[PDB]
Design an enzyme around this catalytic site. Structure first.
Site, short mmCIF file in Angstrom:
data_model
loop_
_atom_site.label_atom_id
_atom_site.label_comp_id
_atom_site.label_asym_id
_atom_site.label_seq_id
_atom_site.Cartn_x
_atom_site.Cartn_y
_atom_site.Cartn_z
N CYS A 135 3.27 1.37 9.66
CA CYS A 135 3.14 0.27 8.74
C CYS A 135 4.52 -0.22 8.34
O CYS A 135 5.44 0.60 8.17
CB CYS A 135 2.40 0.69 7.47
SG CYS A 135 0.66 1.05 7.82
N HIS A 165 0.82 -1.21 0.00
CA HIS A 165 0.00 0.00 0.00
C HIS A 165 0.86 1.27 0.00
O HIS A 165 0.34 2.38 -0.12
CB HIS A 165 -1.07 -0.04 1.10
CG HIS A 165 -0.56 0.23 2.48
ND1 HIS A 165 -0.56 -0.72 3.49
CD2 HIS A 165 -0.08 1.36 3.04
CE1 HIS A 165 -0.07 -0.20 4.60
NE2 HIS A 165 0.24 1.06 4.36
N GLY A 168 2.07 5.76 10.47
CA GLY A 168 3.47 5.71 10.06
C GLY A 168 4.18 4.45 10.55
O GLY A 168 5.37 4.28 10.30
C1 LIG Z 1 -9.37 0.02 7.12
C2 LIG Z 1 -7.88 0.24 7.28
C3 LIG Z 1 -7.20 0.01 5.95
C4 LIG Z 1 -7.52 1.60 7.84
N1 LIG Z 1 -8.12 1.75 9.14
C5 LIG Z 1 -9.25 2.49 9.31
O1 LIG Z 1 -9.82 3.07 8.40
C6 LIG Z 1 -9.75 2.49 10.73
F1 LIG Z 1 -10.56 1.40 10.94
F2 LIG Z 1 -8.78 2.63 11.68
F3 LIG Z 1 -10.54 3.55 10.96
C7 LIG Z 1 -6.05 1.70 8.15
O2 LIG Z 1 -5.49 1.02 9.00
N2 LIG Z 1 -5.43 2.66 7.39
C8 LIG Z 1 -4.02 2.71 7.33
C9 LIG Z 1 -3.59 3.70 8.39
N3 LIG Z 1 -2.16 4.02 8.27
C10 LIG Z 1 -1.29 3.94 9.32
O3 LIG Z 1 -0.13 4.33 9.27
C11 LIG Z 1 -1.67 3.40 10.65
C12 LIG Z 1 -1.23 2.11 10.99
N4 LIG Z 1 -1.49 1.54 12.19
C13 LIG Z 1 -2.19 2.30 13.07
C14 LIG Z 1 -2.67 3.59 12.82
C15 LIG Z 1 -3.41 4.36 13.76
C16 LIG Z 1 -3.85 5.65 13.46
C17 LIG Z 1 -3.53 6.15 12.19
N5 LIG Z 1 -2.84 5.43 11.27
C18 LIG Z 1 -2.40 4.17 11.55
C19 LIG Z 1 -1.71 4.55 6.96
C20 LIG Z 1 -2.04 3.55 5.87
C21 LIG Z 1 -3.53 3.16 5.92
C22 LIG Z 1 -3.87 2.16 4.84
C23 LIG Z 1 -3.56 0.82 5.07
C24 LIG Z 1 -3.86 -0.14 4.12
F4 LIG Z 1 -3.57 -1.44 4.33
C25 LIG Z 1 -4.47 0.22 2.92
C26 LIG Z 1 -4.76 1.56 2.70
CL1 LIG Z 1 -5.51 1.94 1.20
C27 LIG Z 1 -4.48 2.55 3.65
#
Ligand SMILES: CC(C)[C@@H](NC(=O)C(F)(F)F)C(=O)N[C@@H]1CN(C(=O)c2cncc3cccnc23)CC[C@H]1c1cc(F)cc(Cl)c1
Ligand SMILES: CC(C)[C@@H](NC(=O)C(F)(F)F)C(=O)N[C@@H]1CN(C(=O)c2cncc3cccnc23)CC[C@H]1c1cc(F)cc(Cl)c1
Lengths: 301, 301
Positions: free
Chosen positions: B145, B41, B143
């Site tokens: 990931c 991603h 950040g």
């Molecule tokens: C449904 C999920 C895909 C989404 N989560 C939600 O929408 C929910 F449920 F939290 F609201 C989610 O994790 N988005 C991640 C978030 N991210 C992080 O760095 C991150 C990592 N760990 C904990 C965190 C805590 C607070 C903010 N950020 C983070 C950036 C990349 C993004 C992403 C991942 C992906 F695999 C595919 C795509 Cl396209 C986007």
């Protein structure tokens, strides 16, 4: 989000751990520049453990009485001396992996990471706190002496703890890296007991804030206490007194969450009086006191 | 004595963490030999988030569209490919700090250490478990990931987890190092939820054995149970089934303590019925399920 007990990465310290042998005693040493630090009781045999005369045990010894081993290789000992309860062995080679470091002595309530080691090999890392009674609740077996506790600030490793002994209650005691004990303990095989422990109030409050930050809010109420009324309750439950400095320290979390410290104190007072009424806060059914305000800020940013 | 949530020493993994940037996205990667692994991603823009076609996005990229940094040093990317949900970047330098390693896929209930990282820099280490619902209860921010989970066995690092995402309930999902997700999750911003979590029964049993080894017997009882009767009760408290495999796995701890596995099952049933009534086990007021039998043997006397 999420909130976990977290240690600092331990690589910089793993690079410094060695094995020290004297007679048939083996334990861990910390190798920084050209000196190895380890507990002075390494020079003690079981015949003397009851009532050791360290001056006399040391005077009888020479460089050739010690063997220091870093992984595969023997380090040649070229000098030796004692500082308080720590033995210092000078070796012919500076540790190329020496990090930027300081020796610091910590206060009760402060947290640090422990790298548990056996035969000079790092085996596990965990976080704990210096308790108000100057013990730590570690996890340590035979051979773990000389394992160290540390914090990291920037690229600088602050070493704060070296492991020396276990008490009859199963908790642990040790020294700073200059060999001064934390707490009223002596390095001999004798009955010693820790004072009654108390809870680190400021840390509990910090952890309640972390809970709020993570959306656990059921313990909040509309009410507010004073420092003096709170402390009367604290005293009652073997909690440390909350000082004005503690209040100040929690300023950030207070402003971040919209809960005033004396509000959180009212929550904590209710929790002491009434219990958790079957609920949990951050996966715990007890009030956790081994996270500092700084730890809470660190992890939630 | 003592029992702590303990992580593996992180040094071997710290020396593998790098920063990967593509476009305006920066996350962490794992540099092993001449390959950097990271979540695919990283190639997704804020428009691609719902239904990205990663094959289509990747074919549009050149090597030079990816910036890899280790400390200050740029690593020149000279090749790239996708495997499932992980991107593999071939670099022109093999990592001199590459440890012995394997990639393994773990099962629910298994534990590992997580090195949390931001911008390729390690910030903390903690222990967790693969939950029955295929999530981990991590601690991660924006950040993070690309952070990895791992075990170490005899100087060999087994990487089992790469962090990809957070779910609504605040728990975390990711892939093994071959880029297959644990659980039904997908690397897309579409609506996804964790199923109901359940307790890792075999682990709770292991932890009760640890409590016995550490000298506490208060929760034992005079009863035994059939495996079947145990399961019918335990499942009413949302505990996972205990299998004959689990029972065999607990045999070593059974032997050391002299308490039959089915006797320990009877003790657990009673704990579930009665609760702790103000008591604790190994410092906890609830039943801990994130230590495996192997973790207990490793840590215990
Ligand atoms: C449904 C999920 C895909 C989404 N989560 C939600 O929408 C929910 F449920 F939290 F609201 C989610 O994790 N988005 C991640 C978030 N991210 C992080 O760095 C991150 C990592 N760990 C904990 C965190 C805590 C607070 C903010 N950020 C983070 C950036 C990349 C993004 C992403 C991942 C992906 F695999 C595919 C795509 Cl396209 C986007
Ligand atoms: C009253 C205490 C002095 C004594 N306590 C007990 O034996 C009791 F009762 F609490 F278990 C104690 O810790 N003796 C240590 C034990 N040891 C360890 O490697 C060790 C370390 N951490 C936890 C363990 C758990 C189980 C077994 N071993 C350990 C070897 C060195 C020895 C020692 C230390 C010292 F500073 C001065 C002298 Cl002369 C001897």
């Amino acid at each position: 989000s999420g909130f976990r007990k977290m240690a600092f990465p331990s690589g910089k310290v793993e690079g410094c751990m060695v094995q020290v042998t004297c007679g048939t005693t083996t334990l861990n040493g910390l190798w920084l520049d050209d000196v190895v630090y380890c507990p002075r009781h390494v020079i003690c045999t079981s015949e003397d453990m009851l009532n050791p005369n360290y001056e006399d045990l040391l005077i009888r010894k020479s460089n050739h009485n010690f063997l220091v081993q870093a992984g595969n290789v023997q380090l040649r000992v070229i000098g030796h001396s004692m500082q308080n309860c720590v033995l210092k062995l000078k070796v012919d080679t500076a540790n190329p992996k020496t990090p930027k470091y300081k020796f610091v002595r910590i206060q009760p309530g402060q947290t640090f990471s422990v790298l548990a080691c056996y035969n000079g090999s790092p085996s596990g890392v965990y976080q704990c706190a210096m308790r108000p009674n100057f013990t730590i609740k570690g996890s340590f077996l035979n051979g773990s002496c000389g394992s160290v506790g540390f914090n990291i600030d920037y690229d600088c490793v602050s070493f704060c703890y070296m492991h020396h002994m276990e008490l009859p209650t199963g908790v642990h005691a040790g020294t700073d890296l200059e060999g001064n004990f934390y707490g009223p303990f002596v390095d001999r095989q004798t009955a010693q007991a820790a004072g009654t422990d108390t809870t680190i109030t400021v840390n509990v409050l910090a952890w309640l804030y972390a809970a709020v930050i993570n959306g656990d809010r059921w313990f909040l109420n509309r009410f507010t206490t004073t420092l003096n009324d709170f402390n009367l309750v604290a005293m009652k439950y073997n909690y440390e007194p909350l000082t004005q400095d503690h209040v100040d320290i929690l300023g950030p979390l207070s402003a971040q969450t919209g809960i005033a410290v004396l509000d959180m104190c009212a929550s904590l007072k209710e929790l002491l009086q009434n219990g958790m009424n079957g609920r949990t806060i951050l996966g715990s059914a007890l009030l956790e006191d081994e996270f500092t305000p700084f730890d809470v800020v660190r992890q939630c940013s």
